[PDB]
Scaffold this motif. Structure first.
Motif, PDB file in Angstrom:
ATOM      1  N   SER A 111      58.475  35.845  38.114  1.00 33.67           N
ATOM      2  CA  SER A 111      58.612  36.186  39.430  1.00 33.67           C
ATOM      3  C   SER A 111      58.038  34.991  40.563  1.00 33.67           C
ATOM      4  O   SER A 111      58.479  35.232  41.733  1.00 33.67           O
ATOM      5  N   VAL A 112      57.496  34.198  39.948  1.00 35.42           N
ATOM      6  CA  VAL A 112      56.881  32.873  40.850  1.00 35.42           C
ATOM      7  C   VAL A 112      57.269  31.805  40.195  1.00 35.42           C
ATOM      8  O   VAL A 112      56.296  30.878  40.635  1.00 35.42           O
ATOM      9  N   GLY A 294      48.233  29.339  42.616  1.00 38.82           N
ATOM     10  CA  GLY A 294      47.680  30.833  42.699  1.00 38.82           C
ATOM     11  C   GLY A 294      47.355  31.098  44.060  1.00 38.82           C
ATOM     12  O   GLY A 294      46.753  32.047  44.377  1.00 38.82           O
ATOM     13  N   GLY A 295      47.779  30.054  44.908  1.00 37.98           N
ATOM     14  CA  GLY A 295      47.837  30.472  46.474  1.00 37.98           C
ATOM     15  C   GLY A 295      46.807  30.131  47.572  1.00 37.98           C
ATOM     16  O   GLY A 295      46.998  30.575  48.424  1.00 37.98           O
ATOM     17  N   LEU A 352      48.910  40.932  31.086  1.00 35.89           N
ATOM     18  CA  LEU A 352      48.845  42.205  31.783  1.00 35.89           C
ATOM     19  C   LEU A 352      48.032  42.161  32.908  1.00 35.89           C
ATOM     20  O   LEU A 352      48.513  42.932  34.086  1.00 35.89           O
ATOM     21  N   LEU A 353      46.826  41.663  32.834  1.00 38.36           N
ATOM     22  CA  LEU A 353      46.192  41.457  34.148  1.00 38.36           C
ATOM     23  C   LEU A 353      46.966  40.617  35.200  1.00 38.36           C
ATOM     24  O   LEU A 353      46.658  41.066  36.329  1.00 38.36           O
ATOM     25  N   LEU A 354      47.537  39.400  34.756  1.00 37.80           N
ATOM     26  CA  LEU A 354      48.427  38.735  35.729  1.00 37.80           C
ATOM     27  C   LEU A 354      49.328  39.476  36.585  1.00 37.80           C
ATOM     28  O   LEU A 354      49.450  39.079  37.918  1.00 37.80           O
ATOM     29  N   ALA A 355      49.928  40.163  35.971  1.00 36.46           N
ATOM     30  CA  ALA A 355      51.074  41.007  36.435  1.00 36.46           C
ATOM     31  C   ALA A 355      50.316  41.946  37.652  1.00 36.46           C
ATOM     32  O   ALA A 355      51.102  41.953  38.915  1.00 36.46           O
ATOM     33  N   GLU A 356      49.315  42.592  37.416  1.00 37.03           N
ATOM     34  CA  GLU A 356      48.589  43.537  38.363  1.00 37.03           C
ATOM     35  C   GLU A 356      48.195  42.353  39.451  1.00 37.03           C
ATOM     36  O   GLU A 356      48.193  42.780  40.644  1.00 37.03           O
ATOM     37  N   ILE A 360      49.279  42.481  43.587  1.00 34.83           N
ATOM     38  CA  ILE A 360      48.149  42.583  44.632  1.00 34.83           C
ATOM     39  C   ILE A 360      48.431  41.479  45.596  1.00 34.83           C
ATOM     40  O   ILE A 360      48.437  41.718  46.821  1.00 34.83           O
ATOM     41  N   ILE A 361      48.427  40.145  45.160  1.00 36.49           N
ATOM     42  CA  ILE A 361      48.884  39.266  45.958  1.00 36.49           C
ATOM     43  C   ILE A 361      49.942  39.430  46.907  1.00 36.49           C
ATOM     44  O   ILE A 361      50.058  39.323  48.171  1.00 36.49           O
ATOM     45  N   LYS A 362      50.990  40.053  46.349  1.00 30.36           N
ATOM     46  CA  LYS A 362      52.282  40.353  47.118  1.00 30.36           C
ATOM     47  C   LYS A 362      52.109  41.445  48.011  1.00 30.36           C
ATOM     48  O   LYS A 362      52.376  41.205  49.474  1.00 30.36           O
ATOM     49  N   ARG A 363      51.491  42.687  47.771  1.00 27.27           N
ATOM     50  CA  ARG A 363      51.374  43.598  48.495  1.00 27.27           C
ATOM     51  C   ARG A 363      50.398  43.471  49.517  1.00 27.27           C
ATOM     52  O   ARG A 363      50.425  44.096  50.781  1.00 27.27           O
TER      53      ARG A 363
END
Ligand SMILES: Cc1ncc(COP(=O)(O)O)c(CNC2=C(C(=O)O)C[C@H](C(=O)O)C2)c1O
Ligand SMILES: Cc1ncc(COP(=O)(O)O)c(CNC2=C(C(=O)O)C[C@H](C(=O)O)C2)c1O
Ligand code: FES
Lengths: 461, 461
Positions: A111-112, A294-295, A352-356, A360-363
């Motif tokens: 997605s990135v 990572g932003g 699993l953790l990275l997807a969440e 969060i970064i997006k929302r």
């Protein structure tokens, strides 16, 4: 969710950390240890130590904690019964992936993806990300020279005994000040500190100068263009020289901002021209975003600031991304299995953790927040630079990825030690720099809190 | 804890696996993928795939699952609220270790330390384990040459630009057939398959022959003695040769049983004498137990069979141990910090799991179980070898670490493919060998389940 401010009880390391440090030092050299931590009590930007001190953490485990300590969304992931298997059944991902492997990659790393790069291989850390990116580049280069031909009999026989032509004498070009990891391939491209390099065998690979900008930038516009141009010329000269030595440069690696070597910046123009030099000589261009990605620069990947449709051939990542790996262009896809390979190739629990985390970064719009909070931070640093020129110079940064120099290492170290005792954890990079690596839940008011604490520190210093 | 036998629904890979394999192949070369798995339904010795097939797994994710799938003791750990932080707050262990770091090491790795090795550093995989073991050895050898002298002017200068004397031209001696990992330092000591090595730059380091035993062992006692003596001589000649080349051998690395290279064994006597050769020439003796470690040979570390109070200087591990790392003698402890270092140095969540794994291995007497279940397996393989000499030769093993040869790669792969369709997952090594790497909850009754399936396969082959 968020503590209100730091809270100090003892000097750091306190008595309980010192006891644990003494115990650890029996079984290994423990001199690097800062203190011991109570992660169960740590929350958001605040790290709690075993002496009950609560510090504002602007170092975030060498820039590897993406959305703070004990983030509630990650707590809930570990609490779901359906996720237990992921934590206790680790697959050999190269051969027996879990059912949801591809869908979880879509939710996360895919997605990135950087522009132009449709391929992705996962790895467990930044060093094997870079080592396997080197290998991917050597294989691609030999493929250009030979394929669509079969491996020769001689190649197949000589590569088993570490000999050319099966093992070519190709090189990766790197920059002074660089840091790309410490396994023996990475380390050959690392040029940060002598203590990292000394007594370890290396590779005769070309080493180019990275630009040393002069500050403040508005006063040295011409001098800094000249400096960047001189470095670009030396890159090109090196590539020609090493081709003549029969040590062809197959790839160029660079960080968008050099971290461990001292937060060295260069213009977007420099990197654009460097990318061109790479293409022009048939060199793969490898961008190491293990620390910049990572932003925290305000864009997900720092190379995004260059504004290129074709920014690179290969891009490595780790740290904030929880797992490592590298994106790459379709033409770099290995031609056969078992060439880029190892037992685990990362870990589905980290995905699993990275997807969440990515969710969060997006929302919560955290890319925008890093740009905003970072501008508050940098603005404040520029003001302290104005007011304390005898202590602060070369204030620089992008997003929250900020830094400044002190007059020497003793003062650098003294300021970090004082700050820590006042409730703020800072990192050093290079000789005498202080660097900021806040988590992505670092907000304006944390920046203002740091600035007001550090302002008091300078006044008393 | 465990199902009652395999249960097949479809060919493997079945339709749902083939669909996921097509999706994954868009983003990377997925040609190595066997099939996709349902780890949530997998239990004990049985792997369940996405098409609902349930297979007896005798490969255990390349010998990395220690006590089977979905073990209830490990399920319990993840379910405990107090452990949530360990899974979502990953520390930079070198600088900011969690409060329980030392105690959890006492519960786990330190409770199985090899004889004579008081030191322990943790790493996240087998490759960075062996890489940092090499570096530890090079630093030690240089310290022998200079100490008490400090780093010279020239050394500190030259090491930053990849030149001698800062970067010595030392070597690690390794064996034909070896496998030690695929990062560029590891890879120079790997001599398994050309596909692993070809097109990658290497190091000119000495490569010795590994004994090739003749079977049955009972009819080749003299020849096998002579074969080992020949290899030992060639090792010692290489050390002398490379000292003259001014490429001094700082260390020797060896597996107690060569795995990827073709399950090659040698006598305990050979290894004791090799250890002595190493000492004699002042080479560190580095034993790689990444694959043999963790109990399957009947002893926790396979070198324990040699019976030495001083079996090595350094010993690396990973796979079944969940985390990587290396034990080493005190004289090999790094003099200064930040020489052996990386961001994560392992992962405390793997130590949490490993402490429970080691508890189960002890409570359930699994070392002795592996010796027994392995004897039953090997007895059955020897019977099949007698009944099917056209397909089976050189049956060999220690504990459940067993293997045999087939006539050619083509037949090896067909037998593995048929066995999988009949409910049993096997691995291959070398040109034409079939290898067994069962988990530690593999029992004598699973040995018979396999033997009966394989007997039917061989009768119809
Ligand atoms: C740009 C970049 N590239 C590669 C790496 C290596 O990552 P890893 O530490 O092997 O997971 C890193 C890791 N960063 C580290 C330090 C800096 O800052 C210091 C740490 C060290 O090894 O000394 C690791 C990196 O920043
Ligand atoms: C003796 C030994 N020494 C080092 C390693 C490397 O471990 P890791 O794959 O980097 O975690 C390994 C890992 N073994 C692997 C294979 C064999 O069998 C096959 C896998 C591969 O890289 O091909 C990894 C090992 O067995
Ligand atoms: S080299 Fe990356 S985890 Fe070991």
């Amino acid at each position: 969710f968020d503590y209100d401010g730091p809270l100090m009880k003892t000097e750091v390391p306190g008595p309980r950390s010192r006891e644990l440090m003494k115990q650890l030092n029996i079984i290994q050299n423990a001199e690097a240890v800062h203190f011991f931590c109570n992660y169960e009590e740590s929350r958001g930007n605040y790290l709690v130590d075993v002496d009950g001190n609560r510090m504002l953490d602007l170092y975030s485990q060498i820039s590897s904690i993406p959305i703070g300590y004990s983030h509630p969304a990650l707590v809930k992931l570990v609490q779901q019964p359906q996720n237990v298997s992921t934590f206790i059944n680790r697959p050999a991902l190269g051969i027996l992936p879990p059912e949801n492997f591809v869908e979880k990659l879509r939710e996360s790393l895919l997605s990135v993806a950087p522009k132009g790069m449709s391929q992705l291989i996962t790895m467990a850390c930044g060093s094997c990300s870079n080592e396997n990116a080197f290998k991917t580049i050597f294989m691609w280069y030999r493929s250009k020279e030979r394929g669509e031909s079969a491996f020769s009999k001689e190649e197949l026989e000589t590569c088993m005994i570490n000999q050319a032509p099966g093992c070519p004498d190709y090189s990766i070009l790197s920059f002074m000040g660089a840091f790309h990891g410490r396994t023996m391939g990475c380390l050959a491209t690392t040029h940060s500190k002598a203590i990292h390099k000394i007594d370890i065998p290396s590779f005769d690979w070309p080493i180019a100068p990275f630009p040393r900008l002069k500050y403040p930038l508005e006063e040295f516009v011409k001098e800094n263009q000249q400096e960047e141009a001189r470095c670009l010329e030396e890159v090109e000269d090196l590539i020609v020289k090493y081709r003549k030595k029969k040590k062809t440069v197959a790839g160029i690696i660079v960080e968008p901002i050099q971290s461990e070597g001292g937060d060295n910046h260069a213009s977007d123009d420099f990197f654009r021209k460097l990318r061109d030099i790479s293409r022009k000589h048939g060199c793969a261009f490898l961008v190491d975003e293990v620390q910049t990605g990572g932003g925290s620069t305000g864009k997900f990947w720092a190379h995004e600031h260059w504004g290129l449709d074709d920014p690179a051939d290969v891009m490595t990542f780790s740290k904030k991304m929880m797992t490592g790996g590298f994106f790459h262009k379709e033409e770099f896809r290995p031609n056969a299995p078992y060439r880029i390979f190892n037992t685990w190739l990362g870990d589905p629990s980290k995905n699993l953790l990275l997807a969440e985390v990515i969710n969060i970064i997006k929302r919560e719009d955290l890319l925008s927040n890093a740009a905003h909070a970072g501008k508050v931070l940098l603005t404040g640093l520029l003001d302290l630079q104005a007011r304390y020129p005898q202590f602060i110079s070369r204030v620089r940064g992008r997003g929250t990825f900020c830094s400044f120099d002190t007059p020497d290492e003793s003062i650098r170290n003294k300021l970090i030690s004082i700050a820590r005792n006042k409730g703020v954890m800072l990192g050093g990079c290079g000789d005498k720099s202080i660097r900021f690596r806040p988590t992505l839940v670092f907000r304006d008011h944390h920046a203002h809190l740091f600035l007001n604490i550090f302002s008091d520190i300078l006044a008393d210093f």
